[PDB]
């Protein structure tokens, strides 16, 4: 293309890295907190699953 | 002579960005000096005198008229390139036609997102 | 070379389409829910 549509397309590439690592991070944050609920819930969850398997 | 003697006329320059070219060579090689991308300087003066005869004559000039057609040619879509600016900033009306459209199944390609004409209500049957 | 803010929908690429069509369609379906807000506020407030 020319020069001024390269310059807007590379200008939205660059938005759109900048946005998707900003979500990366949101979402490593989100999942830490995720997992530190999760292994309580985990025990909580087998348990409620031991009586079927084992009767 | 039709739009001066009464009657109705239409003409089709098929295309104008070659008139540009033949333009171009001649005034090149009469050694007039070149202008950007080689145009002569007179490249816009070429087409406006000669679109601007596209005229509605009153009833009192007979009430004739000529209705004008130029067909530009893009290079990929650069609607931004000279002559094809030149040429939209002079005309009245345009139909944008687009690969991607006549792709797409749409045809014509006309993109009547971006086709324009000044006239619009006027000109145009009731029922339409 | 930068980037600057509102740069998406200034390439008007896919992106750029895409968020439109993205907000047009929320904002047409809030727009139809304040409509029947109105209509009922409209109707409670004859009296």
Redesign the interface.
Known sequence: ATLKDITRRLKSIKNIQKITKSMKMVAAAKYARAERELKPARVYGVGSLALYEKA | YFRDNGKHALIIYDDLSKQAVAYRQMSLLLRRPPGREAYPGDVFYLHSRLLERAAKMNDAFGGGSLTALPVIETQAGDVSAYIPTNVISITDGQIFLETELFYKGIRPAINVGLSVSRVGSAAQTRAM | ?????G??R????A??KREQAEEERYFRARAKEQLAALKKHHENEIS
Not at chain 3, 1 to 5: D, E, G, I, M, T
């Open positions: 070379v930068r980037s600057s803010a740069a998406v200034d390439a008007g690429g992106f750029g």
